[PDB]
Design a protein around this ligand. Sequence first.
Ligand SMILES: *[C@@H]1O[C@H](CO)[C@@H](O[C@@H]2O[C@H](CO)[C@@H](O)[C@H](O)[C@H]2NC(C)=O)[C@H](O)[C@H]1NC(C)=O
Ligand SMILES: *[C@@H]1O[C@H](CO)[C@@H](O[C@@H]2O[C@H](CO)[C@@H](O)[C@H](O)[C@H]2NC(C)=O)[C@H](O)[C@H]1NC(C)=O
Ligand SMILES: [Cu+2]
Ligand SMILES: [Cu+2]
Ligand SMILES: [Cu+2]
Ligand SMILES: [Cu+2]
Ligand code: NA
Length: 499
Amino acid sequence: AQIGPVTDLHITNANISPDGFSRPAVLAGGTFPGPTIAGNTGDNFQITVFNDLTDPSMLTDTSIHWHGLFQKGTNWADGPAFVTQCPIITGQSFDYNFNVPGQAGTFWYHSHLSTQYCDGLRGPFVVYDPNDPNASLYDVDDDTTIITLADWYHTLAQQEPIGAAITADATLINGLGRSFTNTTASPLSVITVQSGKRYRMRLVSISCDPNYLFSIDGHDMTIIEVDGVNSQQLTVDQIQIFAAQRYSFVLNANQPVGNYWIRAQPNSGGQGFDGGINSAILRYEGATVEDPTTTAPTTFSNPLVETDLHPLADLGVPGQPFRGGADDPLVLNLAFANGRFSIDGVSFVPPTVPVLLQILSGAQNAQDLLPAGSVISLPSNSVIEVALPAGAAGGPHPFHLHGHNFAVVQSANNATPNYVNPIWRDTVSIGGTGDNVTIRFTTNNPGPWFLHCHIDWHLEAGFAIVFAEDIPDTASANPVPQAWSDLCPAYDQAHNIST
Ligand SMILES: *[C@@H]1O[C@H](CO)[C@@H](O[C@@H]2O[C@H](CO)[C@@H](O)[C@H](O)[C@H]2NC(C)=O)[C@H](O)[C@H]1NC(C)=O
Ligand SMILES: *[C@@H]1O[C@H](CO)[C@@H](O[C@@H]2O[C@H](CO)[C@@H](O)[C@H](O)[C@H]2NC(C)=O)[C@H](O)[C@H]1NC(C)=O
Ligand SMILES: [Cu+2]
Ligand SMILES: [Cu+2]
Ligand SMILES: [Cu+2]
Ligand SMILES: [Cu+2]
Ligand code: NA
């Protein structure tokens, strides 16, 4: 069952074996992935998170981010540790009480403390639209049509060297899959469809690192949503999905009744499908209960290309139709050396006092904010452009901005900008050497918003900055509850920190 929009959520440690190998984990709702949190557009969500963690090897503190939800007027509920809150300590709970006006689509939730989400705290978050403009394109849209793609590690995250190229041990599709080494024939996930019906498949990358080449043998996929943003229909036979991205696609169950492989090939770790790695099963009602015998093509003739996507609504692009044509045009210098990433020459290391609390206590320019050089102020009611030129090691880097979605004016692997009708989204691959992926948005949401690579190992190694949007209005726009004000005193007392 789905839970929400008002629900408790317990965070616990438990052993799990999603690929046949047992290890301890950090779980929401006792499962991997966690339960789907759901509601309708405009609803009040009140997710009371109970931190019941006791195993220090995966951290006993926690904090949860609601990925892609704008949090307008509720910056304190966004979740990134040391940006918008101190962590919740064990044996305590915290009500994330916010609203989702003007958003409907496919999201997710995850730990936003250190690399803790890798250890298991990740699940889907769906905001349905009772008047969805795409409703007539499918028959079925429910918990059975959500498809999660996850990387899974045998080594615990806090034992991964910082700045290292860290590689997974299994791909999990809906929580199940087979290990790349010592492969055992452990259970594969089954997605069941009825011949003749059309399904809204909600494809969610809950990855900590790899991107996946996703396809379904014999089937094609009609994209209708990108990171929460409704799209024009685009039919493809393969989707390359980067960490934290989401797509909805229509699956027409129009092939002969049978079993078909679902494939998710990561860019690192095990290559291919030997032993049923990187695989799940699409089963038609009435098919024999057996593994598929289908083949992938050698090459995919209609892969997703990001410039082919366009919004369903007339969203346009803010600003003027040329590079630098914005009120506040930025170019970030994105680099890596010696195990650490930097942005504009500064490697991100989380501050002792969360950025939001520094601002509520009176610090009101970005040079007064800690970490020094890691906070850039943005002016209010202004068009912002951010160029993100690639080349830093460990690519392709999927950059994500909190508090906002953005027009993708220039995409990976294509030097031509689009100032007319690009897709809007919240997480974007910045591509390869020489690319100049560029995003635009308007600043109508006061508060400190994290900008970072969503490969969690890279974030841990410093690949982040904070946009302090409209510092002067942050306090009036974001009144804080007493329970939020209590978090830093409790955390600092528990950890013997003076501040
Ligand atoms: C990416 O595009 C940005 C503009 O959005 C380029 O920025 C210019 O960089 C040069 C130096 O390289 C400066 O003289 C300008 O002030 C910058 N802003 C402009 C022209 O609007 C940046 O060079 C591009 N990077 C790559 C790798 O192509
Ligand atoms: C490279 O990106 C550009 C810009 O998004 C794409 O150019 C558009 O192509 C569409 C489809 O033919 C035309 O309707 C638009 O007028 C083009 N816009 C511009 C500004 O040129 C281009 O198709 C992409 N290249 C590839 C190989 O997909
Ligand atoms: Cu996220
Ligand atoms: Cu986010
Ligand atoms: Cu990265
Ligand atoms: Cu983040
Ligand atoms: Na415009």
